[PDB]
Amino acid sequence: GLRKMAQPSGFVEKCVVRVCYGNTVLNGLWLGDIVYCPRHVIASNTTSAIDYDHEYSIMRLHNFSIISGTAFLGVVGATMHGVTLKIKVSQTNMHTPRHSFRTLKSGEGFNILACYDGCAQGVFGVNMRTNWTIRGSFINGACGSPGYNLKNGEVEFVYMHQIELGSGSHVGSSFDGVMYGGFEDQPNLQVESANQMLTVNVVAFLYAAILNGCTWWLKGEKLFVEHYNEWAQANGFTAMNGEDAFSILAAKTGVCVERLLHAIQVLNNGFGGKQILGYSSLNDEFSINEVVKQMFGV
Amino acid sequence: RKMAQPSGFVEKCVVRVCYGNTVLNGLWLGDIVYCPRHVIASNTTSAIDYDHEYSIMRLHNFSIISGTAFLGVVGATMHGVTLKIKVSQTNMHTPRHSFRTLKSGEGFNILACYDGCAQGVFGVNMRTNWTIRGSFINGACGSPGYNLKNGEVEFVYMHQIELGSGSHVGSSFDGVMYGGFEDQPNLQVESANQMLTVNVVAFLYAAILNGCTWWLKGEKLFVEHYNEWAQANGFTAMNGEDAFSILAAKTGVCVERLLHAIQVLNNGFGGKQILGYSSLNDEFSINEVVKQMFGVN
Ligand SMILES: CC(C)(C)[C@H](NC(=O)C(F)(F)F)C(=O)N1C[C@H]2[C@@H]([C@H]1C(=O)N[C@H](C=N)C[C@@H]1CCNC1=O)C2(C)C
Numbered sequence: 296g297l298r299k300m301a302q303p304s305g306f307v308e309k310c311v312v313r314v315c316y317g318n319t320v321l322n323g324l325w326l327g328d329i330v331y332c333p334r335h336v337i338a339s340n341t342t343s344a345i346d347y348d349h350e351y352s353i354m355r356l357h358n359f360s361i362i363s364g365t366a367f368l369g370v371v372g373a374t375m376h377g378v379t380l381k382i383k384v385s386q387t388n389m390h391t392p393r394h395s396f397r398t399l400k401s402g403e404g405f406n407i408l409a410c411y412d413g414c415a416q417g418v419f420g421v422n423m424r425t426n427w428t429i430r431g432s433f434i435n436g437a438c439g440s441p442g443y444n445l446k447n448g449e450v451e452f453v454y455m456h457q458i459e460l461g462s463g464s465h466v467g468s469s470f471d472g473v474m475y476g477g478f479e480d481q482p483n484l485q486v487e488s489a490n491q492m493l494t495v496n497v498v499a500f501l502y503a504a505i506l507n508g509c510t511w512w513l514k515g516e517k518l519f520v521e522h523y524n525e526w527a528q529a530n531g532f533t534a535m536n537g538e539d540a541f542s543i544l545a546a547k548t549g550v551c552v553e554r555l556l557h558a559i560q561v562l563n564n565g566f567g568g569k570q571i572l573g574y575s576s577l578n579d580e581f582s583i584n585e586v587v588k589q590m591f592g593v
Numbered sequence: 594r595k596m597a598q599p600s601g602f603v604e605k606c607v608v609r610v611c612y613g614n615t616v617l618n619g620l621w622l623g624d625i626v627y628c629p630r631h632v633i634a635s636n637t638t639s640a641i642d643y644d645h646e647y648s649i650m651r652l653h654n655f656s657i658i659s660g661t662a663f664l665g666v667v668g669a670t671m672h673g674v675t676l677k678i679k680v681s682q683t684n685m686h687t688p689r690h691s692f693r694t695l696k697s698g699e700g701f702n703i704l705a706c707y708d709g710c711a712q713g714v715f716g717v718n719m720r721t722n723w724t725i726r727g728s729f730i731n732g733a734c735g736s737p738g739y740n741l742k743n744g745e746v747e748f749v750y751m752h753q754i755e756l757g758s759g760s761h762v763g764s765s766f767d768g769v770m771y772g773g774f775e776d777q778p779n780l781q782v783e784s785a786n787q788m789l790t791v792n793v794v795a796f797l798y799a800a801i802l803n804g805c806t807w808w809l810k811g812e813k814l815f816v817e818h819y820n821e822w823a824q825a826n827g828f829t830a831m832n833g834e835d836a837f838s839i840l841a842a843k844t845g846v847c848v849e850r851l852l853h854a855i856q857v858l859n860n861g862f863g864g865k866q867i868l869g870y871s872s873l874n875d876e877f878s879i880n881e882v883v884k885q886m887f888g889v890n
């Protein structure tokens with residue numbers, strides 16, 4: 296089978312805190328002696344354009360309350376970096392995991408720990424879409440929820456939740472304070488670009504299908520990558536690139552990528568009542584790495 | 594969006610259980626390590642006499658590792674398709690917990706583990722044929738299924754076998770295999786899966802709450818009539834329409850109008866989608882819909 300999994304959340308859970316300032320509560324991430332959180336926690340009035348330089352100049356540190364579980368942390372300073380605050384606290388988080396910070400590229404997979412009131416409530420794997428939004432399930436109080444990847448025994452922190460667009464899509468920032476997609480932490484209408492289906496992931500999905508004995512859709516005709524990309528630009532798919540990355544899957548199956556590109560074109564019109572590993576339509580949720588990991592443990 | 598509950602409380606309980614050449618996962622709670630009994634079987638490609646295997650078990654063949662610490666085995670007893678291995682060490686990270694047995698259609702979380710280390714977490718439903726749609730390869734046995742409720746962990750599933758169809762079967766922690774399946778390497782076939790009607794209705798209510806209403810008509814289908822159609826078309830009966838009376842009041846749409854949509858939509862969406870799906874979806878319970886959109890349990 297093929298299931299969209301999250302990487303385990305235990306290491307990240309110990310870092311989530313509640314950040315309160317004046318009349319707002321949201322979540323922060325406590326690493327070392329710093330708590331990271333969205334800067335709009337200090338905005339007194341969010342019904343019109345926020346002058347964050349002004350809000351920062353009037354910010355008073357005694358209005359913060361930072362809570363780890365049931366313990367209060369002492370706040371000693373706070374600086375603004377893009378759309379984030381780095382709040383310096385008086386104790387080191389002794390549960391800080393081995394970590395780094397990374398900025399997601401388009402299509403890259405990660406995990407969201409959905410937090411409310413400083414406490415984790417759900418965890419899920421997700422992909423950064425080409426329009427720099429994600430389909431999260433975030434409601435009131437979710438800001439500051441962290442996105443992460445586990446790699447080589449290290450936690451990479453990649454996302455801090457910030458806003459919900461009118462479409463229902465979700466936008467966050469890196470921990471550098473750069474909002475994905477250049478969206479603003481401002482209460483005005485913002486519209487995202489059209490989403491594209493991630494071709495590299497659909498291809499990985501079709502390989503997984505072959506490996507599971509689901510091959511009714513597979514045919515012998517190939518479609519060259521340059522010809523597929525001409526078709527993809529006009530039909531809402533990303534272009535194919537990095538074909539060599541599929542070598543492990545092509546070897547195990549004996550099916551070249553260009554035969555799967557041909558399949559994408561035909562199956563984009565619908566499955567006609569058939570299913571591929573349980574889906575009634577093409578699926579771009581799984582990367583090459585996830586397919587290889589779940590089928591072969593590599 | 595399909596999500597799982599956080600895994601941090603369960604992760605501290607997973608251990609590596611090795612007996613001779615076999616390695617799988619165990620669950621360390623108090624001074625007991627729970628794991629599948631086939632860890633002690635000498636040959637798992639032919640029929641297994643577990644009473645024989647238990648009578649020749651030698652405890653020095655066990656190695657149990659939590660993180661990098663070795664646990665000391667002092668006894669082991671067999672209960673159904675599980676072993677309860679008593680160790681000297683009490684797990685100081687044992688959460689408040691209970692053991693519960695899943696009902697047909699009930700949702701829960703799997704922590705997929707290998708070599709005694711968690712690798713992934715995902716939500717699943719116990720299906721009407723007592724299998725789950727998991728994703729496991731060699732070494733996954735003993736991976737635990739859990740729910741977080743009322744400040745405790747409910748442990749509900751221990752992974753055991755993969756059927757020839759790819760469906761997965763586990764046991765409760767009292768050693769009862771879900772569905773009555775055997776921990777034997779023989780051909781066993783599951784019964785036909787049914788679509789969980791209550792979950793489809795929740796999905797359609799979620800569609801209405803997101804203003805996705807192209808499919809919604811005005812005709813009502815009485816519960817008794819729907820159920821007659823469902824028994825012949827691979828759907829479960831509608832039951833407990835009262836839990837949906839909160840959403841019926843909130844949307845102004847009665848369950849009978851959704852039952853009629855299921856019957857119509859089961860023939861296909863005709864190129865349209867519902868919340869991004871091209872066919873009826875039974876993966877989301879009323880609990881999940883309400884938790885994710887309204888924040889309440
Ligand atoms: C959706 C809302 C209309 C409220 C607004 N959106 C837009 O103003 C936009 F459309 F312009 F983006 C919006 O997100 N905010 C308004 C205000 C902050 C942010 C906000 O409250 N964030 C929440 C953090 N706890 C997470 C949200 C809550 C609902 N679901 C979420 O994910 C700031 C931009 C300073």
Ligand SMILES: CC(C)(C)[C@H](NC(=O)C(F)(F)F)C(=O)N1C[C@H]2[C@@H]([C@H]1C(=O)N[C@H](C=N)C[C@@H]1CCNC1=O)C2(C)C
Binds near residue numbers: 617781
């Ligand atoms: C799939 C396999 C053909 C190997 C077999 N299936 C059948 O015998 C059947 F089909 F009948 F069910 C089977 O699951 N097992 C053979 C042997 C144990 C069990 C087994 O290996 N459990 C794994 C635990 N680490 C679970 C994972 C799940 C994914 N793949 C696995 O191996 C026992 C039944 C004693």
